[PDB]
Amino acid sequence: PMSTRIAEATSAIVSKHPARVGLPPTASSGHGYQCHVCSAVLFSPLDLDAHVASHGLHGNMTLTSSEIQRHITEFISSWQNHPIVQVSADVENRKTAQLLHADTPRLVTWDAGLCTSFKIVPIVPAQVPQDVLAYTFFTSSYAIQSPFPEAAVSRIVVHTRWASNVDFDRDSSVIMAPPTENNIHLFKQLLNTETLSVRGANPLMFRANVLHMLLEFVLDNLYLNRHTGFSQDHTPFTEGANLRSLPGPDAEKWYSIMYPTRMGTPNVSKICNFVASCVRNRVGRFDRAQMMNGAMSEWVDVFETSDALTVSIRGRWMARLARMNINPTEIEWALTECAQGYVTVTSPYAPSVNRLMPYRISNAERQISQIIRVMNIGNNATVIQPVLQDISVLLQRISPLQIDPTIISNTMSTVSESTTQTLSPASSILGKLRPSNSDFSSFRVALAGWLYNGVVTTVIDDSSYPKDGGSVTSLENLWDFFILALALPLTTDPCAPVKAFMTLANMMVGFETIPMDNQIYTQSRRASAFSTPHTWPRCFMNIQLISPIDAPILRQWAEIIHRYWPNPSQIRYGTPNVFGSANLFTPPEVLLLPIDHQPANVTTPTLDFTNELTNWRARVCELMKNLVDNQRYQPGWTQSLVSSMRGTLGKLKLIKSMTPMYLQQLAPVELAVIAPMLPFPPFQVPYVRLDRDRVPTMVGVTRQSRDTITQPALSLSTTNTTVGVPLALDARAITVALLSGKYPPDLVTNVWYADAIYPMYADTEVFSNLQRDVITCEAVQTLVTLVAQISETQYPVDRYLDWIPSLRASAATAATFAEWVNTSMKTAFDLSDMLLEPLLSGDPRMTQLAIQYQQYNGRTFNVIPEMPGSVIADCVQLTAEVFNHEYNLFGIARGDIIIGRVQSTHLWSPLAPPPDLVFDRDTPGVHIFGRDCRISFGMNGAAPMIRDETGMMVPFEGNWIFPLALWQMNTRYFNQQFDAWIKTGELRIRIEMGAYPYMLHYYDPRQYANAWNLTSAWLEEITPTSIPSVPFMVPISSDHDISSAPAVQYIISTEYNDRSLFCTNSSSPQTIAGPDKHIPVERYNILTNPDAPPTQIQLPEVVDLYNVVTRYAYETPPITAVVMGV
Amino acid sequence: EVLLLPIDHQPANVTTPTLDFTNELTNWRARVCELMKNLVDNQRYQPGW
After folding, report:
1. A272 is in an annotated binding site
2. Phi, psi torsion values for A854, nearest 5 degrees
3. Are A991 and A896 in contact (CB under 8 A)?
4. How far is A627 from chain B (nearest CA, A)?
5. Radius of gyration of chain A measured on its C-alpha atoms
6. Exposed, middle or buried by CB within 10 Å (0-12, 13-18, 19+), for A702?
7. Contact criterion met (CB < 8 Å) for B44 and A520
8. SS3 category, A563
9. Among partner residues B14, B21, B47, which is closest to A525 by beta-carbon distance?
10. A777 known ligand binder
11. How far is CA A274 from the centre of its chain?
12. Which residues of A touch B48 (CB under 8 A)?
């Protein structure tokens, strides 16, 4: 195909191999292998061929194919050594694209259906035909539906909200089957990659998967209950109750399931006694908030079914968004003073319709997001370059200044000289002022590089330095010095003055000598090599070391650097009210400029010659005139050439260019105009002119702690990681854009900047990154709070899960679990790019977020932002506490089980045993088998054998307590030793777990039952890695009396674990046999108490299943729909 | 009855912190790294870069 053909064509012409890794180049390993005449080594791809061509006689040049491709090699090497194309690349890398544009998350989500998280499923149906009762007692015979299912036994289960019309789903869900089915698939999810059993689970990851389920369960309910409309009742069941009409086709059984007090109570069924015991005026609409005539009411209040958990969760989430909220007047103010005039935006002055724009955050979230982005960008060269180029092309869009490099050709056309003198300074500087491969982007790139010193140090290329050629007689090298000396003060490196000095010191060699630090960095050591404050010679740091009678030129060059170097300034971009300032290391609301700035009062600016830049060009040019007039070092030219030099330099000094005027008194204004409208906010270390102190030697971020130490200011110093990279620029094209600058002939400033600044402010791109940073900070606080539960951390947290078994976690366990938390958080909010991967590179246990920078003397300036509040982790702690008090709801039993034969005609539930069957460690005559027991046999009529923890000898009998791992590690031997004594003998084992899932098998008590098959199956299947669920065998209640039959039990609970039961025999008048539980009136506090206030929840102990709840009609229109201007 | 080995041992614990300079090997790596940091710091050793 053509594409691979062009790929091999390009790779043939350009992509030849040797990329020249930097060795100390050795004689027996050189690129010129044997220079075929001279038989030596030459190290370089142009050296060996230029040397063989030097063996070619010069006056007999002939075209060969070799003669063609030697020029091809020189051309390709010239293109390869170009400073911009080595770093520029068009395609992104999922990192640079993430930085340039972020996946905005889905915040404002809605629920039109009813809010809840629990439901009531029936299990065994009721005896709807029978003998002792007539058929017409039951309301199902007359076919009246009812919210609680008319069945024999009904339990409440957990199913995430099961009723909700939704605008946009959270893909997280927690679905739990009824307890007659299996639920260990909910618990084997997390780290059980080695449980081969489909119905198995390793106990050591129980707590980890339970709290991951808690995170899923809270992460699912992030919706807002929406107002939907109402309707007045016409039936006399509840007078005046404006009932609520959910959307969707199904609307029939919903009113029965929503409003339990609506029905009549014809008989002495348990639900009918309950609804007769309920109060009357507490259903439906009872409070609305109208603002305007004929308009949708904003928030109402309603008496519908909901649990206090999910009500509280969505209340916390709504409080979060209400803190985030803003209003269009402040949008107008903040946007127009962010624009600093030059546009306008209009907000209406009218009574509002009560909308909702969640955008306002505090400064801490922005600072944390700065830390995350800089930690991402750390030492990556090709990531910041597209952002910098984006600001470059944006500034080319915004600027009225047009680079017109022909004007210097126009003015060098009129210089006068002789013709017989064939060293032409004018034509030479036109050739040398011709840039590299037509680039002029480098100036705008360098201008945009002022926004970032702390990550990017813009240096010029080493290729602009004149290749060891310092010959001051070489006018080539002299124009080179002039170009570079104009170009250097634009760069943002801390060492541009010493580089401007040492390029003259490397230019002139052997005329005048200076003393310096060592012989390593001598007077001829290349000027690009210094680049750090420690390499600064104090012949430059002190002018008196340079001898004046010896070195007048060099003394006045060092003096001119010390005096006429530019000075920093500031312009204060930004806005404090909206867009909390991300300006760390600085005050808020400041743009640190490197050059002097003052505003122009005119609106039609025209030429003058008074700023640091025009002064600087005049200074270096008159000093160049002193160079050519140095009588004892350059009289060796012709006087025609001398006068042409003076004329060319005087005209070059009085060139007319609008570039320095622009750079002084126009450009930082629109830098401030742009600077807040960026995907990547500014990041500035304090600029400084020449002094050795107060120069940033580095800048570093942290991600973790080190030891037992906890204080981050102490921990940071041996923990930071250095961030930053130098960038290369074409000083020639820099100087071209400095020397040639042209305004339009009729430019008016407010006109031009109005037309050019307005159409970029129809974009709402800046606002989405705020909510992105919200989700970032909430996610990292969620991560530290959740990882605090499974291992010991440095943050104070309140624990609740401590009774459930848990693994002694390692850093690999914590890292894997944090990946699960990342994936869980990532499923919500609909985003595909990176989230908290910089955090996940390191140890997740001891994490902390901070930054510093160090001066040259040893002074360090750290910034530690305090992590703000987190509604997510707050709600996680809430659900943890609620699960601690309501552990049975997710199919968990506290305590443990006791294995032992119980054969009786009683009907007591194994979820709640009589107290004599259980025993503890305090029970006398009980043998605790803690550790290291052994089992001997019985020799010829003897009894078999086991060793006590206390060293005592004991046979197989009585009351034993096993740690669970003791059974797990040895279950194959222990089953064969123990099971037959469990079946017919007398020993009763109390194994302990803390927590376990379970399944429920029922039976009817009229006939025989036995559970030895189920118990032997469980005792057989249990494994050193995994366990299967614990089967129970619990009876079925009935209204009439039954004749009992004996059953045999083996698995009983320890304490009460029958919390999940809900009103056995609900349609019955009463219940004789089995357990007898009516409607739990503690769940319905509001309906049974006339004294309770409406917004009452007894939430942390028990959770109600019906409460007051508010529903909203807050719309979210976009910003360009709300506010606009022209 | 004993067995020499040129590195200090420790009774086992799985939950020990990853970063720990009580650990001799991590101490060694950290000191070697920060010495090379001290080497590169001021660029008085290499010219040419």
Report:
1. no
2. -115, 140
3. yes
4. 29
5. 42
6. buried
7. yes
8. helix
9. B47
10. no
11. 51
12. 526, 529
Helix A363-377 to helix A381-398 angle (10° resolution) is 120
**CB A506, CB A557: distance < 8 Å:** no
List the structure tokens of A989. Answer: 């084992």
The technique is cryo-EM
CA A389 – CA A907 distance, rounded (Å): 80
CA distance A402 to A742: 6
- The A-side interface with B (CB below 8 A) comprises 518, 520-521, 525-526, 529, 531-532, 534-535, 697, 704-707, 718, 791-792, 808-811, 843, 845-846
User: Amino acid letter at A420?
Assistant: T
**What are the chain B neighbours of A843 within 8 Å (beta carbons)?**
17-19
Residue A618 to residues A623, A709, A1016, Cα–Cα distance (Å): 8, 58, 100
A826: closest CA among A313, A318, A103? Answer: A103
Give this entry's resolution in angstroms: 3.4
Look up tokens 């004149």; give the residue.
A466
C-alpha span between A177 and A623 (Å, rounded): 89
- How many Cα atoms occupy the beta-carbon half-sphere of A252 within 13 Å? 4
**Distance (Å, whole) CA A515 – CA A517:** 7
Q: Phi/psi at A284 (nearest 5 deg)?
A: 100, -165
User: To 10 degrees, what angle do helices A65-80 and A47-55 make?
Assistant: 150
A858: left (phi over 0), alpha (psi -120 to 50) or beta: left
Q: How far is B18 from chain A (nearest CA, A)?
A: 7
Tokens 């009609």, located at residue:
A1113
For chain B, how many residues are written? 49
Closest-CA residue of chain B to A532: B42
Instruction: Report whether A116 contacts A161 (CB < 8 A).
Output: yes
**Chains A, B: CB contacts under 8 A, how many?**
47
CB contact (8 A) between residue B21 and residue A706: yes
β-strand pairing of A698-701 with A927-928: unpaired
